[PDB]
Amino acid sequence: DVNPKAYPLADAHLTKKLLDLVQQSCNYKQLRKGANEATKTLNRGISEFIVMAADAEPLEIILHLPLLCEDKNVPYVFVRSKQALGRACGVSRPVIACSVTIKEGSQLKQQIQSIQQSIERLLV
Amino acid sequence: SYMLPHLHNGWQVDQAILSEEDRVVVIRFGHDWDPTCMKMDEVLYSIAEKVKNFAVIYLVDITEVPDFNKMYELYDPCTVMFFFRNKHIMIDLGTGNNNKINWAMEDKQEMVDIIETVYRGARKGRGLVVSPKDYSTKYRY
Amino acid sequence: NIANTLMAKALQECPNSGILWSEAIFLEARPQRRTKSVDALKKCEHDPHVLLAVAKLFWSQRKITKAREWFHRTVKIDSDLGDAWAFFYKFELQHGTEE
Amino acid sequence: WDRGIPRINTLFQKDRHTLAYDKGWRVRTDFKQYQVLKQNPFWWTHQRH
Amino acid sequence: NHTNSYGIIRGLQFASFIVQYYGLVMDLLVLGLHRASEMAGPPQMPNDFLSFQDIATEAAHPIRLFCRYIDRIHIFFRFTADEARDLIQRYLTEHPD
Amino acid sequence: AKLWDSKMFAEIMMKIEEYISKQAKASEVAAPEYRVIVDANNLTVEIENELNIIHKFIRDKYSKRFPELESLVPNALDYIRTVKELGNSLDKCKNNENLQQILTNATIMVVSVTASTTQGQQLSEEELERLEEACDMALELNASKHRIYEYVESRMSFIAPNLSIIIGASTAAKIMGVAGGLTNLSKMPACNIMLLGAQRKTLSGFSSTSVLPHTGYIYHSDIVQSLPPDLRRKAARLVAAKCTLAARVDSFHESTEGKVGYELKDEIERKFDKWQEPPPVKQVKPLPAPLDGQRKKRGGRRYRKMKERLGLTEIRKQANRMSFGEIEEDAYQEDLGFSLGHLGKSGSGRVRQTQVNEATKARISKTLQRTLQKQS
Amino acid sequence: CIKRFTKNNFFVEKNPTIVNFPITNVDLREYLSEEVQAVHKNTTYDLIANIVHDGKPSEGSYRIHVLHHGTGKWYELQDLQVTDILPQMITLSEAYIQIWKRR
Amino acid sequence: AEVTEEEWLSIPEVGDARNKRQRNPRYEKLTPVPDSFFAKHLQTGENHTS
Amino acid sequence: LELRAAVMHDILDMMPEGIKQNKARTILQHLSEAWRCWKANIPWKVPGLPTPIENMILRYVKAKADWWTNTAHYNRERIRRGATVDKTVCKKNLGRLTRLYLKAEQERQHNYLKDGPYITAEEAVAVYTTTVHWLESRRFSPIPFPPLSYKHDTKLLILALERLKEAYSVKSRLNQSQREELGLIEQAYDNPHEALSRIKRHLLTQRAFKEVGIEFMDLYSHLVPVYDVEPLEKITDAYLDQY
Amino acid sequence: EYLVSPITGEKIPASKMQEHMRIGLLDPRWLEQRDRSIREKQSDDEVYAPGLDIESSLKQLAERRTDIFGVEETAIGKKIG
Amino acid sequence: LGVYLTKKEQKKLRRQTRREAQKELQEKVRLGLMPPPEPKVRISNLMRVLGTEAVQDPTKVEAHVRAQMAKRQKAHEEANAARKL
RNA sequence: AGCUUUGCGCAGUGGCAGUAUCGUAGCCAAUGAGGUCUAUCCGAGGCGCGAUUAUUGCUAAU
């Protein structure tokens, strides 16, 4: 909508599920907020999927994240507002990028796998 | 010295004594150009804000107000008088004179000490309070 | 870049793989941030020449004592493959003292 | 009793063992002036040793 | 504030040791490695305070006694007439009187 | 030997880059201009990847003469220059002018002191046809690195307009060349971009704070050094963050006129002059008035514990009593006038020793115990 | 001459302000009226001797930078000191008395 | 004399630099020494017999 | 008082007679702030201040600082010579001398930083080779690091804690920092193993330390510096000293 | 764009929800300390003189201390000589 | 759709609700619509609160404090029962 | 049908600390707060100010 350079941009149906997963990972200490921490997780190879926002006006500050995901074969998806993503991540400040890491025997494995599957069929 | 409020005529100082009930009126009688009076009119500067709750400081030039020289013995170069609810609070120092501090001191804590002691003894309803320090000497050695 | 993507995909598939984890830090990872990759590989408890990869990383960092200690650890039963013994022999022959 | 510069009564002192591991005590007693504000008149010795 | 970058801190707990050791730095420059290795004696049998195993060692150098307090340094020489005259001449050569 | 032959291809590539850059001085007076920057960056990365191995070879070959100098001189080029200058005989360290141009006076004196106590032995003539050749090619590679440094600095007015204005093209080149290219550092977090070219300087018997620890090219940039030493770290973090914000823009070549770069510079300057703003007006509250007769107070478990902490313990109350007409030997030689009174006195008191209380035991604060937990 | 040592209202101090001054090229033509500037065809001066003072007024030790004419060796003499300094240590130190030559 | 009339109006009001926790400290409680000192002092003053 | 009064009189005199004369207290506060900054040896540069006002305030500060230095030295001379002086006079004079000595120390440290070491490499090598020859002649083995398993490990810790507590052995009332210090020693006595592990870690990997406070005790002849060290680091320093 | 207020459950503009959460949870007792100290300083009476009074007192002091002010020196208490 | 406020404002809002309830209760009691809260007492507080009055008739006093305990526990249990699904 | 995980609420029981709690229509802050170890690493709040019996109420004596 606002930004044509939005490839995996998701609609207002699975965005609710994405934010629910973000909150649950927050309760489980299972996310890294911020573009820099998402990039570090991608570099370490422990990132499972990262969600960013299409409201950051210089989107190219976070447009290296989909390229890094393509390099590491990591699902990636956008949202429609940075404020909602930030508030869902567990912080008041607007966040434009968050990552979800791994956990041994995680109770969120089924939902994170479902989210990975849902995003991967939305690229086209 | 020059920063503290000044009183110009006889009526003003009597009003300043009368226009207050819940603090102590500390009046520095003397001449603000005196080396002695200027020594302690800066101590009274450095503590004017600190003792705002229970003390107000007015300055009086005896030449400008020649109405209290005879009655209160204003002939030492510098004099400090404490008043509470229109009542001169006598204070017992180490010196013989027990109605005034006729010398300019140097430490900003001792003057607040004396003012707070005067306030404490005046809330009770005394007329003569006793200073903590003894001024029968100068502790020099 | 294609090799880096293939290495990332291989790491994503059964990361516990000793050979892939050992050959990732030394080959794909640059000397800068190689230590982080070395720690990530060491996060896997098993050391089938992974300790040898740590020894190679230490030798690249020119740490003689650390390289010798890792090679002694690598030459043990943890990484008892002959590659560790050959690397230890080469390093001892290439040591500054060579005594 | 009460004779000898290292007073004989020190031999019977309770902490005699641990004072055996206290070496250079007089030097640090001398330098105590730089760590504590008030000067020690008995800087030259130490009542324990 | 100021960042101490040139002076030892005497308020430090171990400072004494440093000073003592650093005193061991300077006093040998006064003694020289030879005389220092005669007051201290052989490491096998170190001497006590102000004592030499042989009389010849005392008679082998000007500096016969030495004692070092925290800052104070206390030397006691013993010059024969000839060496005293030699030292006086050496001083006066670099200092006309 | 093997390293010198390896640099031959790199030497030819550097000669080609020199021909291109000399032509760049004429062509700028189908092989575009940007590629002449990209391939040059690749070539400087390669010459660094050869400088490291030749420095390793120099350290390995020279450890026979002096095995401690590498632990005292961390920087590579400094190590090559020092081993080139000292030579086999180390008596060339006293009042040596060219040592000063490479090493700090403190580290000059530490390496000289180590040179006094060396267990290394002299090198043969064969070692002097290897180490000096390696040092010469190291200086040649450094000259090539600087000769492409100037060209990259000149051309970052075009290749990275946004990043070249926040920090300046010089430090911009120093941080983009070492990072492996603009694309490489675009994938790099600002925290890592801070440590670009962060030398692990060997502390010369100093506090680690004195020799800047964890300090990178961004901390040595002109913008941060303009600030007082206390704010520099806080300024370094912010300037590196905005540097990577501009770097991600410049990687994909947006805002080539520098609008985002100017916006980031404006934000940096606003934060800077907000930090340097003088403190505001703070009112001097007066001392509280002397208290009145009585005031009602609460009481419970908290008041009970306050009364327990400040209550007269039996050992304390027994010490206050000081007998009468009973001389006692002056305890605590270092300060007399400290008598325990009836505590441990045969005059009066309990037959059993006064047992020590537990409520008066010394206790640490909550925040201080928190510091203990974090420190461990 | 350079006014380093000056008395305050209470105690005499020194003004330790370093000066950056050349030694072989200076122009002074702006300091003369033109009705006099025409007379002089040489307003350029070269330093010859320099005076540098040490420490407090009550504890001082003068040092001298002399230029050996013909050559360019600047030599530092305190009491018997002899040292051919470079033309930069003359600028770094704080001067007190300078000697020139109009040539 | 050559200071503009507005520049005297543009004089900034200086303020204190120190924070609240150093300008206006909460009153520092002055507690007694732990009584373990009274016991230790007498404990050090007892000797053995052999 | 006379100098400050003259400065304020001139400034208010040439200050325009408008409503702006409400800014007299502002000028006095500026004067006090500049004097404090010179006393605190802290940079003082008001951005919006006019250059004539700034010049006059600098001259005021310089004059009062000259008088301050002279008066402090004269009072010190009075005290050392044995003259009769007051207690508050001694306190103020000690404060002034502390400020002056710390300014001189800032000068000396900054001079060392820019001038590098004052010891030449030649003399340093001579001293070092003398020391190493001495130590080799004495057959002195180097002091080993305090091992994890040391037989006398707690004995040295006990002695260090007792020494640190000797400063409070004679005491009736304790400040907050003192209470926290006693808490630290008694906790380290309660858990010697963890405290000694902390000490070993500090000795092995700690090189950045918190600022140590300074003051001066006046003997009326010279001033002895008194250094206050961080309470936790005092324990480590004492154990190291004992070992 | 409309969101739902977490505290009131009412449609809110998406642009304001940040400061909406900042301010809708404004702590009620904060209002008195905002409206209490300001009243204290409003009713507070000054301690030092008005600036014109400092100016006048400075003139009067300069009238006497000719050892500092003026050009015609006289006694400490004398007006002029 | 709604947004999920963070744990900091969770704690802040909970504190607002509890302080609001406490102040409303205190204002109502100051009005007097309910009696002033009788001090909650347990077995450990039995002789701290009522001991002087508990010496004369100890069993009556312990019966009263146990009745207060039972009333509190019953309020809790039937509050859960009312909140039971 | 239970079992079970996590967050948020309501209460209950019990322990522990009162050198600490609290406010932020003040400012900045994951577009990075803050960095002593270990820094191509770490990575959430920090600052300034105000309230204070070092959170705040009643009841109770004097």
UniProtKB/Swiss-Prot annotation, chain B:
A Pfam family assignment: DIM1
Impact after mutating residue 37 to A: Viable when expressed in S.pombe
Residues that bear Phosphoserine: 131
Cellular compartment(s): Nucleus
Alphabetical UniProt keywords: Cell cycle, Cell division, Deafness, Disulfide bond, Mitosis, mRNA processing, mRNA splicing, Nucleus, Phosphoprotein, Spliceosome
Record PTM text: The disulfide bond seen in structures determined by X-ray crystallography and NMR is not essential for protein folding and function.
UniProt entry tagged with the keyword DNA-binding: no
Entry superkingdom: Eukaryota
This protein's GO CC annotations: cytosol; nucleoplasm; nucleus; spliceosomal complex; U2-type precatalytic spliceosome; U4/U6 x U5 tri-snRNP complex; U5 snRNP
GO biological process, one term: spliceosomal complex assembly
Cystine pairs: 37-78
Associated disorder: Burn-McKeown syndrome: A disease characterized by choanal atresia, sensorineural deafness, cardiac defects, and typical craniofacial dysmorphism consisting of narrow palpebral fissures, coloboma of the lower eyelids, prominent nose with high nasal bridge, short philtrum, cleft lip and/or palate, and large and protruding ears. Intellectual development is normal.
Cited function: Plays a role in pre-mRNA splicing as component of the U5 snRNP and U4/U6-U5 tri-snRNP complexes that are involved in spliceosome assembly, and as component of the precatalytic spliceosome (spliceosome B complex).
Family the UniProt entry places it in: Belongs to the DIM1 family.
Protein name per UniProt: Thioredoxin-like protein 4A
Taxonomic lineage from the root: Eukaryota, Metazoa, Chordata, Craniata, Vertebrata
UniProtKB/Swiss-Prot annotation, chain F:
Motif Nuclear localization signal (NLS), residue numbers: 295-308
Positions bearing the site annotation: Interaction with U4 snRNA and U4atac snRNA: 214, 237, 242
Phosphoserine, modified sites: 323, 339, 376
Domain Nop: 159-277
Predominant location: nucleus
Site (Interaction with U4atac snRNA): 233
Domain of life of the source: Eukaryota
Disease: Retinitis pigmentosa 11: A retinal dystrophy belonging to the group of pigmentary retinopathies. Retinitis pigmentosa is characterized by retinal pigment deposits visible on fundus examination and primary loss of rod photoreceptor cells followed by secondary loss of cone photoreceptors. Patients typically have night vision blindness and loss of midperipheral visual field. As their condition progresses, they lose their far peripheral visual field and eventually central vision as well.
Protein name in the entry: U4/U6 small nuclear ribonucleoprotein Prp31
Gene: PRPF31
UniProtKB/Swiss-Prot annotation, chain G:
Domain of life: Eukaryota
Cellular compartment(s): Nucleus
Family label: Belongs to the peptidase C19 family.
Function: Deubiquitinating enzyme that plays a role in many cellular processes including cellular antiviral response, epithelial morphogenesis, DNA repair or B-cell development. Plays a role in pre-mRNA splicing as a component of the U4/U6-U5 tri-snRNP, one of the building blocks of the precatalytic spliceosome. Specifically regulates immunoglobulin gene rearrangement in a spliceosome-dependent manner, which involves modulating chromatin interactions at the Igh locus and therefore plays an essential role in B-cell development.
Subunit structure: The U4/U6-U5 tri-snRNP complex is a building block of the precatalytic spliceosome (spliceosome B complex). Component of the U4/U6-U5 tri-snRNP complex composed of the U4, U6 and U5 snRNAs and at least PRPF3, PRPF4, PRPF6, PRPF8, PRPF31, SNRNP200, TXNL4A, SNRNP40, SNRPB, SNRPD1, SNRPD2, SNRPD3, SNRPE, SNRPF, SNRPG, DDX23, CD2BP2, PPIH, SNU13, EFTUD2, SART1 and USP39, plus LSM2, LSM3, LSM4, LSM5, LSM6, LSM7 and LSM8.
Name assigned to this protein: Ubiquitin carboxyl-terminal hydrolase 39
Organism: Homo sapiens (Human)
Classification lineage: Eukaryota, Metazoa, Chordata, Craniata, Vertebrata
Residues of the full protein shown: 453 to 555 of 565
UniProtKB/Swiss-Prot annotation, chain K:
This protein's name: U4/U6 small nuclear ribonucleoprotein Prp3
Mediates interaction with SART3 as annotated region, ranges: 1-85
Name of encoding gene: PRPF3
Localization per Swiss-Prot or TrEMBL: Nucleus; Nucleus speckle
Record note on modification: Ubiquitinated. Undergoes 'Lys-63'-linked polyubiquitination by PRPF19 and deubiquitination by USP4. 'Lys-63'-linked ubiquitination increases the affinity for PRPF8 and may regulate the assembly of the U4/U6-U5 tri-snRNP complex.
Disorder association: Retinitis pigmentosa 18: A retinal dystrophy belonging to the group of pigmentary retinopathies. Retinitis pigmentosa is characterized by retinal pigment deposits visible on fundus examination and primary loss of rod photoreceptor cells followed by secondary loss of cone photoreceptors. Patients typically have night vision blindness and loss of midperipheral visual field. As their condition progresses, they lose their far peripheral visual field and eventually central vision as well.
Expression sites (tissue/organ): Highly expressed in retina, liver, kidney and blood. Detected at lower levels in heart and brain.
Domain of life: Eukaryota
Span within the parent record: 436 to 520 of 683
Main function: Plays a role in pre-mRNA splicing as component of the U4/U6-U5 tri-snRNP complex that is involved in spliceosome assembly, and as component of the precatalytic spliceosome (spliceosome B complex).
